[PDB]
Design a protein around this ligand. Structure first.
Ligand SMILES: NC(=O)c1ccc[n+]([C@@H]2O[C@H](COP(=O)([O-])OP(=O)(O)OC[C@H]3O[C@@H](n4cnc5c(N)ncnc54)[C@H](O)[C@@H]3O)[C@@H](O)[C@H]2O)c1
Ligand SMILES: NC(=O)c1ccc[n+]([C@@H]2O[C@H](COP(=O)([O-])OP(=O)(O)OC[C@H]3O[C@@H](n4cnc5c(N)ncnc54)[C@H](O)[C@@H]3O)[C@@H](O)[C@H]2O)c1
Lengths: 399, 399
């Protein structure tokens, strides 16, 4: 069969064979008891760069030795991409949320042999889920692979914004000292109220990381947590997201992207935040109206915004979040730290081995199967399409 | 009496009357049960900028109404400073570690009316403690005022270094995407070993903040913690600092500066770190040999270094830590967030009220009194002088 694997470019100065450290830490299992991926073998070295074109997710030997054709490319956006040329006979398409191959209805209709859309990471909203249901395609992703990695990045960005790290580093590297300039907007998080929209694998982990900072913890979710968990963390529950915003100094977004959540942060809902609130979004870029965020930072409704996720991806070179006031943005990186890459490469292989050998894919990895939501898809998503507007990624140019 | 108060400059665009938020969080007491400062009154608005020249620590009304003269200046370094002109008849000298008036032996000898050297913050190593003992001067500081503020900054910098935040933000603001360039040095902290040199008010708080990240926790201290605390956090104890370094992926320094600790990190002791270790130092700059740190980052012995403290302060414009590889420096700011400033301004007033009214200063605020170490000074310090080399601060120029 043909397998198309869309991956991001190698580093600008080439694909490295040496790294800052020699080993990854040992991790035995995930916090809810889920086991780490269980492929029969791996053909890579843990800790290596796996998610760029020359890393190939360590999949070449495995696939070729079975007689399959692996096509690896970074060319994904626009009507003349390499992806577009391989659609006609692709049986499996693999991509990562960090550099996503958008599988719109029109593209799925061009793909008559397509059976499996595989997300190397977590969040399958770059595939039109309504269309995958309609055309009987399986959508799978590597549940839990980087949920803890992302919760680290959330805490990092909450602290970065509130304490005013980025402009303070610039004063240091530019030869200055300038204490009052640094601290005119610098606070401690101690005693602040923080709320998360959703307490899933990431959102619950974020609450647990922030408890010892002596922040007052708030949440809302489609699924309420057990009473024992609420009581252990002294959680305040809010029945709707809109009830929660007014109560929080800091809000973090941790839900998936689907029609119930698309553009949930907008000009109208921002009016409900406290003046000078901080907003962190490592979930998906399209939860926020792009221009509403910029306006709120210009007026002081938000004291700061930070996240690693944008819409579309890659973001155009002049996307306004790059240069808006008081921002702590990164490109989409938290879920593709080197540590997470080894877990999701092993996971991608586990799913392919099941698929090719005719064994069932883990229920926790399933999003869509057999014309409906399935596995974690049924818990966390709703039916619909979130890919509208994704053609705009074609405008990005390297450098 | 004459009170000399050395404070840092106002912000470059002037002293503000508006802030990003309207209120500070309420804090009731410190974690070990110590009460917050108890001055009889305050003449400032909590949340305002207090530690610059125009903030005056909110002390003018109080002092003048008692018939005392308050001299406020930022001019402190060099033989022609304002500080130098006021030494001859100063009874009280106040300064903050962020912008410290170095009270060397020669300066103390010029100050025949001097009775009280007051540290607005924590860490009184910019005063020659041997000379204050010899000349019967009281040295006091505002214990606990910003210990929790600093422990937030430590976690922020540990995450920033390991996850590679700063260079990733630059790719975002410069129009790029460049995932592989960002994550070629990006790891999770999950499962790493972290050790602190000292577990005092800051160091113990840092261990408590990092426990839920599932890091393996290590420490050493002059004073060992109770067995119950070691057992609650699953702490690994090391009897010397040198035994601890080899066991750690990440090392954080949280001890005071005195002869036992001066230049403890140097070319010889860096050889004991794991290759690719991360070092964070928000304690004092002079714990580290300046050029040894630079060498270790050039060879890859250290994968990164970050901190807010330098020697001398302000650091010269070409101090090498500003531009060394893989650094996450800020100027000295963690202990002077707006939240901490209100606690230490109230504290500075509490001590002055005791002093002027002939009441005893809290034992927990004392460093030196009556020709010996006293209060927290006796617990945490040794006799000696750490001010050698501080004349070099005169080389700093604004901008
Ligand atoms: N690198 C990254 O920045 C990155 C990495 C992983 C995940 N993510 C994003 O984070 C999302 C969550 O990840 P996870 O591992 O926590 O997944 P999860 O499935 O365990 O958690 C999702 C949670 O959102 C809740 N939810 C669904 N719809 C909701 C709605 N209408 N309102 C409130 N809550 C709702 C679900 O009940 C669930 O608790 C992913 O779907 C992905 O989009 C981003
Ligand atoms: N803004 C800042 O970056 C900032 C703010 C506050 C404090 N600090 C620095 O941090 C230091 C500690 O602050 P704290 O509030 O934790 O003080 P603390 O007195 O409560 O803790 C100091 C700890 O260091 C230990 N110690 C003393 N000598 C030691 C040695 N030889 N080896 C190992 N441990 C030793 C003591 O036993 C004590 O546990 C201060 O003295 C100051 O220099 C910096």
């Amino acid at each position: 069969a043909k397998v198309v694997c869309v991956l991001y470019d190698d580093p600008i100065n080439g694909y490295p064979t040496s790294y800052a450290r020699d080993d990854l830490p040992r991790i035995d299992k995930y916090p809810d008891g889920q086991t780490l991926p269980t492929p029969k073998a791996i053909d890579f070295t843990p800790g290596a760069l796996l998610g760029s074109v020359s890393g190939e997710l360590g999949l070449r030997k495995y696939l070729e030795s079975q007689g399959h054709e692996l096509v690896v490319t970074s060319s994904k956006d626009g009507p003349d991409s390499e992806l577009e040329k391989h659609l006609h006979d692709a049986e499996v398409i693999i991509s990562q949320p960090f550099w996503p191959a958008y599988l719109t209805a029109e593209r799925i209709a061009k793909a008559p042999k397509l059976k499996l859309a595989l997300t190397a990471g977590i969040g399958s909203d770059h595939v039109d889920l309504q269309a995958a249901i309609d055309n009987n395609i399986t959508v799978a992703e590597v549940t839990y692979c980087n949920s803890n990695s992302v919760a680290e990045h959330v805490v990092m960005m909450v602290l970065g914004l509130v304490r005013n790290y980025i402009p303070s580093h610039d004063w240091a590297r530019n030869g200055g000292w300038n204490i009052a300039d640094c601290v005119a907007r610098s606070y401690d998080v101690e005693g602040m109220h923080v709320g998360t929209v959703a307490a899933g694998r990431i959102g619950l982990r974020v609450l647990r990381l922030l408890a010892p900072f002596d922040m007052h913890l708030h949440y809302t979710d489609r699924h309420r947590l057990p009473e024992a968990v609420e009581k252990e963390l002294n959680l305040t529950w809010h029945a709707t997201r809109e009830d929660m915003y007014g109560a929080c100094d800091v809000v973090t977004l941790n839900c998936p992207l689907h029609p119930e959540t698309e553009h949930m942060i907008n000009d109208e809902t921002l009016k409900l935040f406290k003046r000078g609130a901080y907003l962190v979004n490592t979930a998906r870029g399209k939860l926020c109206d792009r221009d509403a965020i910029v306006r709120a930072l210009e007026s002081g409704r938000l004291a700061g915004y930070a996240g690693d996720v944008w819409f579309p991806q890659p973001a155009p070179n002049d996307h306004p979040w790059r240069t808006m006031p008081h921002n702590g943005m990164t490109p989409h990186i938290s879920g593709t730290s080197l540590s997470a890459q080894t877990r999701y490469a092993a996971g991608t292989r586990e799913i392919l081995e099941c698929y090719f050998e005719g064994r069932p894919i883990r229920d926790e990895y399933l999003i869509v199967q057999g014309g409906g939501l399935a596995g974690v898809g049924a818990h966390s998503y709703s039916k619909g399409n979130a890919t509208g507007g994704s053609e705009e990624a074609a405008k990005y140019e390297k450098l």
